[PDB]
thyroid transcription factor 1 homeodomain (Rattus norvegicus), 68 residues
Amino acid sequence: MRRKRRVLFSQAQVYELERRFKQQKYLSAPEREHLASMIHLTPTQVKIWFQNHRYKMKRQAKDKAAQQ
C-alpha cells in the first residue's frame, strides 16, 4: 500500500511477518531478500523486524543475553 500513512510497516505487513516468523524461524541470506521483494520492504527493515521479535522473546523474563 502507498499514498497512505503506512510508510514503515502496516497491519497487513506485520501480519505476514508474524506468520512467517511462526512458520520459518528466520529467513536465510537469499530468502530474507526474496521476502523483501515479494511482500515489499527492504532486506534491512525485514532483518530489523526479525531481530526485534527474537529480542522480545529474550527480554521476556529478563534480558538473558551474555548473562553469566
Q: What stands out?
A: Residues 43-59 form the longest helix (17 residues). Residues 1 and 10 are 9 Å apart (CA to CA). The chain has one domain: 1-68. Helices lie at 11-23, 29-40, 43-59.
